[PDB]
Ligand binder design. Sequence first.
Ligand SMILES: CCCCCCCCCCCCCCCCCCCCCCCC(=O)N[C@@H](CO[C@H]1O[C@H](CO)[C@H](O)[C@H](O)[C@H]1O)[C@H](O)[C@H](O)CCCCC
Ligand SMILES: *[C@@H]1O[C@H](CO)[C@@H](O)[C@H](O)[C@H]1NC(C)=O
Ligand SMILES: CCCCCCCCCCCC
Lengths: 203, 295, 98, 236
Amino acid sequence: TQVEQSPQSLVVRQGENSVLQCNYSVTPDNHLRWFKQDTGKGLVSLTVLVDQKDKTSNGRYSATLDKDAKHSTLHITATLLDDTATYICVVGDRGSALGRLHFGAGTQLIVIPDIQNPDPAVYQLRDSKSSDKSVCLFTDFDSQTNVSQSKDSDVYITDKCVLDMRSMDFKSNSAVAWSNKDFACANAFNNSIIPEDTFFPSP
Amino acid sequence: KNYTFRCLQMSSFANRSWSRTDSVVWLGDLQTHRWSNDSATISFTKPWSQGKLSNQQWEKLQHMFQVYRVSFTRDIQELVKMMSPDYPIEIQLSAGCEMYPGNASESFLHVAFQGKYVVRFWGTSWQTVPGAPSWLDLPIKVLNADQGTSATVQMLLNDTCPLFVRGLLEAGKSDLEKQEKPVAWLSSVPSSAHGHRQLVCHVSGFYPKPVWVMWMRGDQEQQGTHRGDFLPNADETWYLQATLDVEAGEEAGLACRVKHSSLGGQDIILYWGSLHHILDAQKMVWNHRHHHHHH
Amino acid sequence: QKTPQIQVYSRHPPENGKPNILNCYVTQFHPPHIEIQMLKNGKKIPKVEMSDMSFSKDWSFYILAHTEFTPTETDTYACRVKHASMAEPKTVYWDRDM
Amino acid sequence: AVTQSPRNKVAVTGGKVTLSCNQTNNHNNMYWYRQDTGHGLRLIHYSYGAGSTEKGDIPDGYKASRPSQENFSLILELATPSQTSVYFCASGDEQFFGPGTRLTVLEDLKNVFPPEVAVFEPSEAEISHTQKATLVCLATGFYPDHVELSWWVNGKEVHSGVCTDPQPLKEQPALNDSRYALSSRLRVSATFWQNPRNHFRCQVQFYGLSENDEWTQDRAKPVTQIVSAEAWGRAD
Ligand SMILES: CCCCCCCCCCCCCCCCCCCCCCCC(=O)N[C@@H](CO[C@H]1O[C@H](CO)[C@H](O)[C@H](O)[C@H]1O)[C@H](O)[C@H](O)CCCCC
Ligand SMILES: *[C@@H]1O[C@H](CO)[C@@H](O)[C@H](O)[C@H]1NC(C)=O
Ligand SMILES: CCCCCCCCCCCC
């Protein structure tokens, strides 16, 4: 591969700055372009760098290019939630139609929300159609908590998910667990580390 | 007193997956550089071929051409794919600058397709010449969209060519002003016309190029004397013959006179039928197989 | 597609028994791809040096081939050129009188 | 703007697949890439205009066709499982990329299942404690992982307060052709949930077999379909 990006993936706290690297060996190096790829979408151009020593700026995005080092850096200042996407570095070897674009694998950017008031709890939710089927919802925990996977093949646990209640300006994390079975919500996330003040309501 | 510097590139494309590019560089009629397809490096054919440029200045210039050769190859074959989705294809480049006293110069970049001149770099872009095939319009438009190349070519023609050549002229002043004495000999062949003979005055080994060779009858230059083409020797000297058609019996009295800058006014005069001429001829007798046809 | 022109000539005055250099100067050809052999008595001369190929103002290609040789009364010398503009290769013998 | 069709396709080994690409940008150059994890886009085929088609870096198993300036097509004569990828089309005079096509080539269609969908109503404990109400939607037992989940409140699709799992999980992780499960969340205010006039619907678009695909098995044909679960507001 002639275009390498680092890191593989980057986790940053909402509102902080994130730095993404590009290193290439493409010859010749006409221009360098950064793309943003939202999950399940196409590549959308962010900025173009043309000169030997170039600097570019577009809102929160700012990039630099050094052709003598064959190196580029993309800065995201005051990162937002919707900035969660794959960022791809692209080098073009001509300034004409006869060019070939060289692609890097991309950096996956994960923006974790700053939860000001953690209210961690595990709730039991019942099926709309049937009474018997139920799920467990671990919710309102701080981004300090990592949700571990299931050690039992009969128990299914999802990875954590961030939801924005827009008009309320309220963000919360949640993970869902269920089992086909002695299974109970109070010990459903027993493979993960829980906060001391986690609310476990009695069924 | 003017000196022409020329970089000559010849590129062959036999099909989609075959190509070679070879180049030679001349300062006047002296070869200064060679660049074989086989070599990743431009080679010097003189000890002064670098000119006045530094090592770091040369490396940056060579690297630029190294990127160029790879890029040119790929660009041509991608253009082939545009126009004829014919073959084979021959492309020639003539790039350089002519020098004038003092410090003034005119640059050029000529491109030929299949041995016909079609495109030149003029000012800031590529331009088709008058009487060129109209299918070139699209490739020209495609190539003119490249601003990086345009700037780099401009720098090379406007600035780099004259700066380098002036350095070459001072570095190679000694070899350019070098004087080499010609040697001459006489022979004869049958003329194409019945009863006639063609006298040949061979003049070989002279440098520089300019020479004067005439057949004489005393004070009278023979108006039938025909200069041949200048032909090169391997040691960078020159060969030329001056022929004269005569009727059998009119050979006597004739002389071949040669004037050159290396002789300093002391002309070489070879007389037909002299003691010297008889001696040289018997040293070169042969069986006459398979002599050139006569009709 | 243009036909090669072959001119064969010695560097120094031809003298029987004395070492010399024979030149084969091939001109006016196109395309550049060409095979050039210098022959002594019909057999290929192994020690033949070739100059770099170039072209002239009319875009036609030219190249000089040279080898060390000794002229005699009986030994024949020739230059044989293979090119796509010709069906068979062209052989031009050295004539010292030309 | 660059359009691709289809957006999702499930195919069999040895079947024919044709991916379309349309652009009204009036560009001469058109490109076909595929995206696979740990690589970066790789060129399959490209075109210099109407009539032109050229091999890229990875053309094997793929054909291309450019009948007009607007259309460029990628043709898979005999589809293989390795040709499972996301395909991107591009055009240029700078390249402009399409939204992509998700293609899954399988060895056998006898493993293709549509999802079962269930909606889980908010707990009273959450409502009392947070004055908010979270609905959980569960999409279960589908193959392959070709689902698009969406929440519909009172007949209009909502985005506010929704989080859907980016990745599905394997119901049997030790199996090569395991069925999948996807979950999603819609969180509203307690008062909004406590309104019996409020209707909530979880919509799951599944991509599977097409009209011309042959099916013989006793159970229902696992075609491309919408499966939905719903819940009404509760005062109580
Ligand atoms: C001339 C006098 C110099 C004095 C020095 C004497 C030393 C003798 C050395 C012997 C060499 C003899 C060869 C004679 C040929 C002279 C032609 C030189 C033209 C140099 C063009 C430079 C630009 C170039 O290489 N661009 C090609 C990459 O362009 C890409 O990369 C560039 C960076 O390197 C830029 O980023 C550019 O934008 C990009 O497209 C690009 O495919 C382009 O279509 C190539 C095709 C253009 C040509 C038809
Ligand atoms: C020749 O021209 C250059 C700039 O075009 C200038 O720097 C230089 O002084 C001139 N040469 C001489 C010998 O004056
Ligand atoms: C109809 C003939 C098509 C041949 C394509 C060759 C294009 C090379 C362009 C040379 C100009 C620099």
